[PDB]
Design a protein around this ligand. Sequence first.
Ligand SMILES: CCCCCCCC/C=C\CCCCCCCC(=O)OC[C@H](COC(=O)CCCCCCC/C=C/CCCCCCCC)OC(=O)CCCCCCC/C=C\CCCCCCCC
Ligand SMILES: CCCCCCCC/C=C\CCCCCCCC(=O)OC[C@H](COC(=O)CCCCCCC/C=C/CCCCCCCC)OC(=O)CCCCCCC/C=C\CCCCCCCC
Ligand SMILES: CCCCCCCC/C=C\CCCCCCCC(=O)O
Ligand SMILES: CCCCCCCC/C=C\CCCCCCCC(=O)O
Lengths: 355, 355
Amino acid sequence: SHAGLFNLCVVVLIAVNSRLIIENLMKYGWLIRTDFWFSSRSLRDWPLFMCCISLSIFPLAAFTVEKLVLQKYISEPVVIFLHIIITMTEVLYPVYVTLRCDSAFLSGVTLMLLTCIVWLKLVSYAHTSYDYYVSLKSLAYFMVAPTLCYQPSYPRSACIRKGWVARQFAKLVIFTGFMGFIIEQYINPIVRIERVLKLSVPNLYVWLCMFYCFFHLWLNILAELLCFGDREFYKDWWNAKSVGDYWRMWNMPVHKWMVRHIYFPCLRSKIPKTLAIIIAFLVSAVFHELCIAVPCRLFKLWAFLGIMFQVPLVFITNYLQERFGSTVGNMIFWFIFCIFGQPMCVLLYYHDLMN
Amino acid sequence: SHAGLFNLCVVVLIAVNSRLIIENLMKYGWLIRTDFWFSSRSLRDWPLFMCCISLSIFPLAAFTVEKLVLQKYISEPVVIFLHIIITMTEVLYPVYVTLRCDSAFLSGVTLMLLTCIVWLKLVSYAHTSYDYYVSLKSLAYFMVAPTLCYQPSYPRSACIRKGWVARQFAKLVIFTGFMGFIIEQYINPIVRIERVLKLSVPNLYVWLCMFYCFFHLWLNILAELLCFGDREFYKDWWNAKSVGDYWRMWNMPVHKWMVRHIYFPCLRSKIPKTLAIIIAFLVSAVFHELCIAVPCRLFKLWAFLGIMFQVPLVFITNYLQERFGSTVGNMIFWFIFCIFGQPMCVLLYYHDLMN
Ligand SMILES: CCCCCCCC/C=C\CCCCCCCC(=O)OC[C@H](COC(=O)CCCCCCC/C=C/CCCCCCCC)OC(=O)CCCCCCC/C=C\CCCCCCCC
Ligand SMILES: CCCCCCCC/C=C\CCCCCCCC(=O)OC[C@H](COC(=O)CCCCCCC/C=C/CCCCCCCC)OC(=O)CCCCCCC/C=C\CCCCCCCC
Ligand SMILES: CCCCCCCC/C=C\CCCCCCCC(=O)O
Ligand SMILES: CCCCCCCC/C=C\CCCCCCCC(=O)O
């Protein structure tokens, strides 16, 4: 029920290194100096964080495709064409903003992540129903809601616990600081066969702390502050028998965005392989490549090819899970997630950024 | 439900070191050389493993205190005196065997562990009921049963699954070999403030692998071969809010041996502190000191004082868990279990053995 071994990992990586106090060298307010964003309100990161506010205008377009009634100057291919156009400019504008304006790493990462999330929300709004109104602020709650499925009707009318979520925010900032410490003093000295695994041992813990920061801490804080309900935002992916089992429980918001893309809304095409393994993962590869490669300002297509090489890993690991046990299935998931996977998909870009 | 992060730890400590194959130097059948027992059927370990067979004769005595009916030549203090005597000689004979006969470490460890388990089984038989028979082989099943409570009546009338248990035995031998590898190449080079934690980081993983070997693997194999049922042999101790909570779910056999020692069979004395914290833990300290110090053949009383100083940690950590959070309570449990606890309670004796 609780965390358990995560607190063990945190305290043992505190205990391994000699910085037992927050003052490492001198005058450090946190346990690490501010290395994630730093600077101030300057022109380096000014258009990147002002672009995310611009991502509010694309839901505001899409409601004005649907709040415009369908007998009022719009026809049946026109509304789909407007939906495709207002999603495509929504993707293409922050890419141009991040590539033109030279900036840091994390500001581009959060702008691009917000762009991908807003895109998935937009596509889930566009095709989810039958065809001045009474629901004009439903899209303004779905924008800052964790789910990627429209008309949730999940109970907002509840007592907001101002407590617990505050503790969760403290856990969030201290684990982001722990992420920064592991990055600064475990991976940065390495950059300037088994050496790849020696390089990739700390970034697996960095990804584990990333998942604890976003899906358990941040997504529950977001579901609590606007009192969504703190719902199931993932299942037990850490005991993934296969990597295809990993993809269906690491992200319960994205998986419900996939069900319209796989089941009865998309069951009119009747194809097993491309509809689940290729184009549903082409979506995730595009919105991985945009999230990792555009902030580094070099396009080597490594995150895209990493996810597209992780696509045959589904077919290999499901059969290897059927062949071997659920133990060796999870061990081969952890090894294939460590050395050729999502942590290494940011290790390559970090090495290309810091060299 | 599954293991999850344990397979991650196994594969990441495989990936850290360069021995990616079982042939480390030359001719190694396992992934470590045979260092646990080794030798052969020689006179060094001959009386130690022949003493465990002798531990069968003390249940065979105790049934002959109870199959001898209380109207047949025995009175009410005499049966209790016979019970005390046949438990005390049961403890004191393998101590003399291990101390007189100079031998290895693990043979003494398994002899003393069997002595402690047989003692707890004997005490839980002497006082568990009201007062040639029809149940003459019940004590010969309780001897090789995981529980420490008498008259279980748990269903042996079931089909033994020959599968899974075999897989569990393969997991057991490979995790014992992985234990030997971590001991050989992570702790042995260290022996000849933060240096104590640098010494005690691999032994926490060694204890984690010991718990996975004994309580999840070996005890389920034992409960399968005799088709006991593979019952609850521990609960989630890894998310212990306190060490006082850790002691009640690390060992569900020992905890039910403690419930008769605390509740209604032993509630006639009505004392809160000594009946739960001192003399219910003096048992565990004595049968820790017999297990770790007698095989090392030096009596520095370190495991006994380690458990007895681990006793006030219950009183500190219950209030510190009421004060701080369940996250910080688990982190302080993991730190207080790492540096001054059961893994360090074998680290001191291993340092004194290998130097
Ligand atoms: C006049 C005054 C001026 C106006 C003032 C206005 C303020 C301006 C603007 C603010 C933004 C605009 C707000 C508009 C949209 C609101 C959306 C929102 O609030 O959250 C909704 C969303 C969560 O998305 C994120 O948070 C992502 C961002 C988190 C990144 C880190 C960011 C730190 C943040 C701030 C730093 C500030 C600190 C000080 C520095 C300041 C100096 C520089 O939830 C979902 O729906 C998703 C659920 C579905 C999951 C999708 C798939 C899962 C994907 C990934 C898993 C991998 C994640 C790894 C994480 C990568 C990084 C390690
Ligand atoms: C004519 C032919 C000759 C005659 C042939 C006969 C053979 C003679 C004899 C064999 C024994 C006598 C059998 C008689 C009794 C049977 C009892 C039995 O079988 O198990 C019952 C018991 C389990 O106890 C153990 O196994 C403990 C032993 C495991 C130790 C390792 C041992 C490896 C074993 C063998 C090695 C051999 C390999 C080849 C080498 C050979 C060359 C040298 O279960 C419970 O009830 C307990 C549940 C309650 C829990 C109590 C509290 C929890 C405590 C601790 C947690 C910490 C554990 C740390 C682990 C310590 C190590 C790091
Ligand atoms: C090694 C240094 C790490 C620095 C921080 C990490 C930077 C990149 C982090 C995450 C990239 C995106 C991961 C999740 C992608 C899914 C996004 C989506 O599907 O829309
Ligand atoms: C660091 C090297 C490790 C070598 C193997 C470990 C040797 C000792 C292991 C366990 C000792 C006993 C631990 C549990 C004691 C409980 C016994 C009881 O309550 O009867």
